[PDB]
Design an enzyme around this catalytic site. Structure first.
Site, PDB file in Angstrom:
ATOM      1  N   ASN A  43      -5.358   2.857 -20.883  1.00  0.00           N
ATOM      2  CA  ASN A  43      -5.128   3.242 -22.273  1.00  0.00           C
ATOM      3  C   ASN A  43      -5.919   2.505 -23.350  1.00  0.00           C
ATOM      4  O   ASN A  43      -5.927   2.926 -24.500  1.00  0.00           O
ATOM      5  CB  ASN A  43      -3.625   3.206 -22.586  1.00  0.00           C
ATOM      6  CG  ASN A  43      -2.995   1.858 -22.313  1.00  0.00           C
ATOM      7  OD1 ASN A  43      -3.369   1.155 -21.369  1.00  0.00           O
ATOM      8  ND2 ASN A  43      -2.012   1.498 -23.130  1.00  0.00           N
ATOM      9  N   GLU A  60      -0.712  -9.182 -19.013  1.00  0.00           N
ATOM     10  CA  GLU A  60      -0.155  -8.362 -20.088  1.00  0.00           C
ATOM     11  C   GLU A  60       0.424  -7.152 -19.368  1.00  0.00           C
ATOM     12  O   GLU A  60      -0.318  -6.247 -18.985  1.00  0.00           O
ATOM     13  CB  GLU A  60      -1.262  -7.925 -21.045  1.00  0.00           C
ATOM     14  CG  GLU A  60      -2.164  -9.046 -21.515  1.00  0.00           C
ATOM     15  CD  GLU A  60      -3.033  -8.636 -22.698  1.00  0.00           C
ATOM     16  OE1 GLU A  60      -3.537  -7.489 -22.712  1.00  0.00           O
ATOM     17  OE2 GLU A  60      -3.220  -9.468 -23.612  1.00  0.00           O
ATOM     18  N   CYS A  77       1.890   0.143 -24.635  1.00  0.00           N
ATOM     19  CA  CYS A  77       2.715  -0.917 -24.064  1.00  0.00           C
ATOM     20  C   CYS A  77       3.587  -1.584 -25.130  1.00  0.00           C
ATOM     21  O   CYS A  77       4.780  -1.793 -24.924  1.00  0.00           O
ATOM     22  CB  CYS A  77       1.786  -1.909 -23.399  1.00  0.00           C
ATOM     23  SG  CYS A  77       0.222  -1.065 -23.003  1.00  0.00           S
TER      24      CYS A  77
HETATM   25  N1  LIG Z   1       1.343  -5.994 -22.560  1.00  0.00           N
HETATM   26  C1  LIG Z   1       0.140  -5.499 -22.732  1.00  0.00           C
HETATM   27  O1  LIG Z   1      -0.644  -5.959 -23.532  1.00  0.00           O
HETATM   28  C2  LIG Z   1      -0.353  -4.294 -21.927  1.00  0.00           C
HETATM   29  C3  LIG Z   1      -1.708  -3.778 -22.157  1.00  0.00           C
HETATM   30  C4  LIG Z   1      -2.140  -2.656 -21.400  1.00  0.00           C
HETATM   31  C5  LIG Z   1      -1.292  -2.035 -20.441  1.00  0.00           C
HETATM   32  N2  LIG Z   1       0.025  -2.585 -20.259  1.00  0.00           N
HETATM   33  C6  LIG Z   1       0.878  -1.898 -19.251  1.00  0.00           C
HETATM   34  O2  LIG Z   1      -0.044  -1.299 -18.281  1.00  0.00           O
HETATM   35  C7  LIG Z   1       0.520  -0.058 -17.792  1.00  0.00           C
HETATM   36  C8  LIG Z   1      -0.463   1.051 -18.053  1.00  0.00           C
HETATM   37  O3  LIG Z   1      -1.731   0.645 -17.447  1.00  0.00           O
HETATM   38  P1  LIG Z   1      -2.145   1.163 -16.007  1.00  0.00           P
HETATM   39  O4  LIG Z   1      -1.188   2.201 -15.586  1.00  0.00           O
HETATM   40  O5  LIG Z   1      -3.591   1.513 -15.941  1.00  0.00           O
HETATM   41  O6  LIG Z   1      -1.978  -0.131 -15.106  1.00  0.00           O
HETATM   42  P2  LIG Z   1      -2.251  -0.427 -13.569  1.00  0.00           P
HETATM   43  O7  LIG Z   1      -2.122   0.752 -12.810  1.00  0.00           O
HETATM   44  O8  LIG Z   1      -1.430  -1.657 -13.254  1.00  0.00           O
HETATM   45  O9  LIG Z   1      -3.772  -0.930 -13.468  1.00  0.00           O
HETATM   46  C9  LIG Z   1      -4.346  -1.733 -14.540  1.00  0.00           C
HETATM   47  C10 LIG Z   1      -5.741  -2.184 -13.961  1.00  0.00           C
HETATM   48  O10 LIG Z   1      -5.444  -2.884 -12.666  1.00  0.00           O
HETATM   49  C11 LIG Z   1      -6.318  -2.462 -11.649  1.00  0.00           C
HETATM   50  N3  LIG Z   1      -5.701  -2.617 -10.333  1.00  0.00           N
HETATM   51  C12 LIG Z   1      -4.921  -1.767  -9.574  1.00  0.00           C
HETATM   52  N4  LIG Z   1      -4.540  -2.272  -8.411  1.00  0.00           N
HETATM   53  C13 LIG Z   1      -5.108  -3.537  -8.415  1.00  0.00           C
HETATM   54  C14 LIG Z   1      -5.058  -4.553  -7.444  1.00  0.00           C
HETATM   55  N5  LIG Z   1      -4.420  -4.517  -6.257  1.00  0.00           N
HETATM   56  N6  LIG Z   1      -5.740  -5.746  -7.734  1.00  0.00           N
HETATM   57  C15 LIG Z   1      -6.440  -5.903  -8.933  1.00  0.00           C
HETATM   58  N7  LIG Z   1      -6.508  -4.917  -9.904  1.00  0.00           N
HETATM   59  C16 LIG Z   1      -5.829  -3.751  -9.601  1.00  0.00           C
HETATM   60  C17 LIG Z   1      -6.501  -0.961 -12.018  1.00  0.00           C
HETATM   61  O11 LIG Z   1      -7.542  -0.331 -11.275  1.00  0.00           O
HETATM   62  P3  LIG Z   1      -7.541   1.276 -10.943  1.00  0.00           P
HETATM   63  O12 LIG Z   1      -7.636   1.988 -12.287  1.00  0.00           O
HETATM   64  O13 LIG Z   1      -8.758   1.404 -10.112  1.00  0.00           O
HETATM   65  O14 LIG Z   1      -6.230   1.581 -10.247  1.00  0.00           O
HETATM   66  C18 LIG Z   1      -6.686  -1.034 -13.527  1.00  0.00           C
HETATM   67  O15 LIG Z   1      -7.991  -1.472 -13.925  1.00  0.00           O
HETATM   68  C19 LIG Z   1       1.877   0.092 -18.534  1.00  0.00           C
HETATM   69  O16 LIG Z   1       2.955  -0.339 -17.693  1.00  0.00           O
HETATM   70  C20 LIG Z   1       1.685  -0.772 -19.767  1.00  0.00           C
HETATM   71  O17 LIG Z   1       2.892  -1.213 -20.363  1.00  0.00           O
HETATM   72  C21 LIG Z   1       0.498  -3.707 -20.993  1.00  0.00           C
END
Ligand SMILES: NC(=O)c1ccc[n+]([C@@H]2O[C@H](COP(=O)([O-])OP(=O)(O)OC[C@H]3O[C@@H](n4cnc5c(N)ncnc54)[C@H](OP(=O)(O)O)[C@@H]3O)[C@@H](O)[C@H]2O)c1
Ligand SMILES: NC(=O)c1ccc[n+]([C@@H]2O[C@H](COP(=O)([O-])OP(=O)(O)OC[C@H]3O[C@@H](n4cnc5c(N)ncnc54)[C@H](OP(=O)(O)O)[C@@H]3O)[C@@H](O)[C@H]2O)c1
Ligand SMILES: NC(=O)c1ccc[n+]([C@@H]2O[C@H](COP(=O)([O-])OP(=O)(O)OC[C@H]3O[C@@H](n4cnc5c(N)ncnc54)[C@H](OP(=O)(O)O)[C@@H]3O)[C@@H](O)[C@H]2O)c1
Lengths: 474, 474, 473, 473
Positions: free
Chosen positions: B153, B249, B283
């Protein structure tokens, strides 16, 4: 023998099972400590979590007073505690009393250091005009329940360095001393009991680190782990910690780099004091000398004589070299000695072992091929590694997976500073042996020697988070 | 197919395998990104470590200069990057462009903040009279190689927030964008390429996090891991990191506490804006309203009406509500909606899904017995939970495992400040929707929302360590 | 060619003017206004009126204005430099360098200032009963700041005051030195083109001996940021009453040379520090205190390097150019005559052509000689031999000046211990003294000044604090 | 009877003495020396001689001395308070409170000061070419600090200067008020018993009318820390020259009362802040600026609470006690008379018996009355009715005083907005003004002061900085 008890929720408790503790030097039984059950550990954490909110509600100055009281009590009983601490870890009686004294000094300093805690006010107009009327009032809050784990060689000193900093900020403590040193640890606990801190604010845990060690670290009631000990265990705690914050003080192999323009007499004395203190059973200590060849013979000859003047004996007499913590530790050291010897190293002082008391050994002609040049001995064995350039010393120094501290002996400061930037350690002392010395100073280790920055001021910062309250002005 | 490449050691590279990226709102192919193998990852890391020393040897102002060029390039190309970003993650074009502008601002601010890196001189005489002539000159130093990982996002914005703070400090980077968002990630890479930073200082990695994710995190070349993503993956990263430092995060379920004396009109607007931004795919966002019964009827009515005013459509039309990121998500969100409806909550909007586009929906009378009360939907669904006391609102709020941010709508500031102290979150906004807003402000999450404190300044402090040089004045 | 003052957004002339002449050629450069008290009153009234709306802006907005001004100076560095070079007879290339330095300082102050932070203090730190009481402390501007620069760095030492003052929300009344007022107003142009709000930045030209005391005594001024002679500085100290001030005054920086010094490295640093801009530098090696044993060698090295210095006109970028005026030249020559006449060993010929004085090195200078204590502000360097480090400290501290000092030696710990004993603001080890690196604190002890400068400190110095206390419930 | 000054470790009397009498009874308390200029010269000579070795001590050693002094004060709080109460006609219990407060500040400064840190700056932050250059900046004492306290807080406002000074490594020359010098000498006793080195802590007594200027103008003094009237303060400003100073002058604290204010809470705070120590306080509500629609109700609450105020002798801890001296009461009477003639309404009896004036509440006070602006230092509270917040601010800022302000409202965002506009040092929301919690900053805007107090700021103020710069190789 006396059955010591843990201090839990304002009460002294025994466990269905116990662990007998013996004096490393005399072999006499000192007493027993509880061998807690997981359930009992649960009760400790549940108590501390329950007491946290009211502890945090108190004013900083209030919490400070409690800590000062503990210090005062420790000072009053510094000789009773030292008597037993000396016995529990085969440490010289005087230094044992010294450890207790430093513990009080740290607790006092942390108390006054932490009560001056401040917050910040940030301007939105610093980042964008549209937000010029928006401000952030940022204050510090505790992380909650802190799990403190101290080492056998400084079971009290390295307990207070964690406990006081944690408490002044409003955190609650669950203290787990090393098994060998748990009596001294519980003796420290008595001081917190008498100071009268509310029940659950300060609690102790005892049991074999190899039986409940993982359970206490993995428990989700714990919000922060502050540890001191071997790298092996630190790694484990690192994982079990998950995403929770930690602080680790691990293994060391401090190198003393000696250049051609060094005051050889000052270098020899510093190395002697740093290498053989507490029979080398010190974390931050000179454990390898990297000296430029042209000055090696002279430096080694000086160190040799000084080693001969070291007193060998019982902690009772405050001997320089006392018996090592246990048999295995001594066997391990003999192993390093054998390897260095088989591979050509030259022992300039008698190799002798009586029980677990090993005589101070100076090994010259040590090479990067010998175990002794890399592994942490924790025995009175100092290896000399002759180099041919500053570049070589740095390479060798950084090759170690350890990076606690380093000493540079030279009369060329600018160069020393330049060399310092290159060394992968936390602290570099110029013309002085390494030392955690001056607890207000930052203390840390690079690579596998630790995680986080210690030293009173830093410890407090480390065990606190922040609470930001944002609002627009009208 | 339009094949994008990774930026490695100053060169652009493809891999034997690729991953095709499609527009979530139309299905149209945008191109493909490399699916790196472990060997290609090993090379990225080996190239970075090699370039780190020469990068650290540069002056702060020089590294700042490089960062400022990247920022200028991003501003110049904000329409280009915004256009593709908009299509890659089905985000409104105008907000997409805004993300790029936000990224440049952050890069510029980190450049200037970091070049003013300061150190401290500590007095030995502060701790003991005997060390009065001993001082400690402490300077900041980089940790080494930082692995940055952004979310789908804010693939660019949450990339810059890690890269720039890291680079100004002397660390080198390995940037892994999310797969759905990797094209936007490589576009950002272009700016660092054109800016001309030395080869190896900045590098990218693309591939499925479920195929190489663990590999890149577990690699021992990485000294630091800065990640923004789901709590699940975060927990995972916490463990694989071992004892290495990290910044996380994660998930959020920010609550909006509404007191009886709140400005209901102002509260409704903030809630509508905060909860439905980017179709709830944020988030830091109001994901649950805890409102006092007394004013709930009036508040709910305002929110309901504002929801029906929200525009729904394609990203190129700058619609408020656009299609969710993928089918799994739309499915999951639809699941939460149905569970609330079936359990009896009051739907104040029609339930409607077309493709992966879920129409904004409001639920009243949501109870803790409903999934929508706790789970992060990441969709346009807002639950309203009525309470009868601030005490209950605080309990329900702290009951959640998430504690990113929170909103308190009231006119009693003193009390608002009091409630803030009790809320287990990083930031509390008074009379405003939650927001990471004003990037100089601290940004952190309690409990399972994160680890570490972001915000430009804090980011820099987190990705640097300390080097202490101690000597005696004569 | 008549130059005008910039007042409340408008360029204004005065009936009475002051012609400025090139110190090196004597050719008329132009004329600057000779303001009357009433005119000065309008400048101040304009500033006070504009200060509220100026302060009301976001920090970032004010920074953007300053970044603008800076960019404009970089664009016109040659144009401004060419005239500055001629107005104070400074090497052309170094004159351009002053402009660049001014731009750099403005940019840096811009970014240092927008990062202004506040504090949140806990009542519970002091007493339990006040634990719910907190203090939110934010920084605010003082108000109207009067900045006065010196002839040797009319632009550089102008921007070093203006930018820090403005970024924090203060308004400026800039008074350049008469000899240097054209360069000052040229700078004023950059501020005008930047478009800062009318009244935020204003200039005042006129003879300091005719209006100097008035501009400082005016009760509208809230802060005086001055650079100049100690005599004037001290006067400002008194006229300021209790109002806050910053003074950068006279200096006689000493270069202590120990027996274990790198004589080659010491000589070059001393030449550079002592003869730069014909010795017309406040922070500069003005006396060498050297251990006898290495005196002979060091002196020989310095003698040869002196002879390699170029002597000429500002357009040729000579190392040694004509002094600022005839009165100063007469003074420097008097100091040279007093040393020679008292038996000092002159290792360089004595020669004055117009107001161009050739660089001269005096050895065997005793405390009996004037040159040993008075700030010359000319190309003359005295060498005083000592027999111990203790004597060098005594001779150094004996001076009423204490800006900076240099210690040449390989014994760092001993150097640090000496620095503590030296009554100065900054001590450079194995390096000539210098204000160098503007983020570094710059201050002088005793009669050298008051207040700590350097970007960060300047800003802190020109802002006060506003504490808002309340109780949490 | 005859008290002595503590000079260089010895207690000394002077050829002449000054008798001190109880403001409330008139009885003789004793006498204090009336030093000659020569005796002052010995005090300064002694302190400057012991300064180096005092500075050579470790921070913790100096903090230990301060702690002992504090402990001795707590041990003798009654003994000292009893005499303090009589010397300035201050309630016995609050007199003992001053001593305690003084001990608390001494302990706090000791621990605050020992943690003093310095900083390391990177040359590479400003220019790439100086990336190997770093500046090690450490804090140094200014030297000899002259501390001068006011009659109303002779011990408290003495220790607030002495402790922060000493911990930093400076030496002290303490000059208490004549009416209060005995208390001051009693404080000196604590420092003598603590055993600080000779010359480190010294006291000076004599009429500030004969030696006042001498002690300030003396060139041995490096820093003057003063608390007193604006008049004497303005004068010390000039006599200071360019030397650093700290001034805590007069105040006319305003309490702004909005329509949404908790009138009962507001009134209680006002009564407590206004009449404390018979209005003989600097930080205190001295004028109420209340919105018309709520004045009648607030004035009535204030009127009643005033009548509950006790009136009598200090030994009885009366709320209202006799004023410091005759002239003061004459002065107050002059204010009451001008207020009456011009129309104000006195809601409580106007009565004077000796130098004891009964608490007077004046309503319907207009900006034409002297009472609206002049600092009374008497139990007289003027109520000024306004019809808009904008007016309240205008009237408030119109004063030449700006020590502190109170805003009674419930619209915080707005209060903060009003606070930014108020030209004071500190603004208390819904609470009477106060130096409140000594770690909080204490400062006055406009003519209310110079420098920032509060333990932490005090220490920073009386210290300079020493920068050692070198290049890494
Ligand atoms: N608090 C904050 O500031 C903040 C900021 C941003 C997002 N968020 C949270 O993030 C979520 C939405 O983001 P999302 O769905 O894209 O998150 P996600 O699925 O956890 O993945 C985030 C990043 O992690 C990578 N990733 C996946 N599996 C991994 C592994 N085993 N080892 C290392 N990296 C790995 C992903 O790669 P791939 O795309 O290749 O799977 C992607 O670049 C929500 O729950 C939101 O609340 C929080
Ligand atoms: N850098 C520093 O500041 C520093 C300070 C102190 C020590 N050290 C290092 O520590 C070592 C000597 O200390 P040591 O022999 O006591 O180290 P250790 O064997 O690692 O044990 C340290 C502490 O960890 C506990 N422990 C053991 N297993 C555990 C587990 N699975 N989970 C949680 N806690 C567990 C121990 O309990 P039991 O005693 O019950 O087994 C003991 O209290 C040396 O390598 C030395 O360099 C470094
Ligand atoms: N803002 C604050 O924190 C603060 C604190 C306390 C008092 N005040 C203000 O102080 C005033 C009441 O105090 P006060 O009547 O004692 O003040 P004062 O008359 O100004 O005198 C204060 C001190 O100054 C000494 N003094 C007199 N003439 C002097 C001179 N020429 N040079 C140097 N020192 C000289 C006095 O000595 P003698 O006793 O010999 O005259 C006394 O110790 C009020 O205006 C009040 O607001 C403000």
């Amino acid at each position: 023998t006396k059955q010591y008890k843990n201090y839990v929720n304002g009460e002294w408790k025994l466990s269905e099972n116990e662990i007998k503790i013996y004096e490393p030097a005399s072999g006499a039984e000192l007493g027993s400590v509880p061998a807690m059950s997981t359930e009992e550990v649960d009760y400790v954490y549940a108590s501390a979590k329950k007491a946290q909110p009211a502890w945090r509600a108190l004013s900083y100055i209030e919490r400070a007073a409690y800590l000062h009281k503990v210090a005062d009590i420790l000072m009053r009983d510094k000789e009773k505690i030292g008597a037993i601490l000396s016995k529990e870890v085969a440490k010289g009686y005087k230094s044992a009393v010294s450890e207790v004294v430093r513990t009080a000094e740290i607790i006092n300093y942390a108390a006054e250091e932490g009560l001056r805690m401040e917050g910040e006010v940030l301007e939105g107009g610093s980042f964008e005009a549209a937000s010029k009327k928006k401000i952030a009032v940022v204050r510090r809050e505790p992380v909650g329940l802190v799990l403190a784990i101290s080492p056998f060689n400084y079971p009290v000193n390295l307990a207070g360095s964690k406990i006081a900093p944690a408490l002044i900020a409003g955190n609650v403590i669950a203290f787990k001393p090393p098994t060998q040193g748990s009596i001294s640890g519980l003796l420290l606990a008595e001081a917190f009991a008498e100071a009268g801190l509310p029940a659950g604010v300060f609690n102790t845990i005892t049991g074999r680190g190899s039986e409940i060690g993982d359970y206490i670290v993995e428990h989700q009631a714990v919000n922060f782990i502050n540890f001191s000990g071997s790298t092996g265990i630190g790694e484990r705690i690192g994982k079990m910690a998950g995403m929770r914050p930690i602080m680790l003080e691990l293994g060391g192999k401090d190198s003393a780099i000696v250049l051609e323009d060094a005051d050889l007499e000052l270098t020899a004395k510093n190395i002697i004091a740093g290498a053989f203190g507490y029979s080398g059973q010190r974390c931050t200590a000179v454990k390898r000398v990297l000296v430029m060849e042209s000055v090696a013979d002279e430096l080694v000859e000086k160190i040799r004589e000084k080693v001969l003047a070291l007193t060998i004996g019982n902690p009772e007499d405050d001997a320089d070299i006392t018996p090592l913590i246990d048999t295995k530790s001594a066997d391990y050291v003999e192993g390093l000695i054998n390897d260095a010897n088989d591979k050509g190293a030259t022992a300039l002082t008698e190799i002798k072992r009586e029980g677990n008391l090993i005589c101070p050994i100076l090994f010259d002609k040590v090479t990067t091929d010998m175990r002794l040049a890399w592994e942490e001995p924790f025995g009175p064995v100092l290896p000399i590694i002759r180099v041919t350039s500053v570049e070589e010393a740095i390479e060798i120094s950084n090759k170690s997976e350890y990076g606690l501290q380093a000493s540079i002996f030279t009369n060329d400061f600018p160069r020393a500073f330049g060399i310092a930037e290159q060394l992968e350690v936390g602290t570099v002392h110029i013309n002085n042996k390494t030392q955690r010395g001056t607890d207000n100073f930052p203390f840390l280790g690079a690579k596998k020697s630790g995680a986080g920055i210690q030293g009173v001021k830093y410890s407090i910062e480390a065990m606190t988070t922040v609470k930001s309250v944002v609002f627009d002005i009208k």
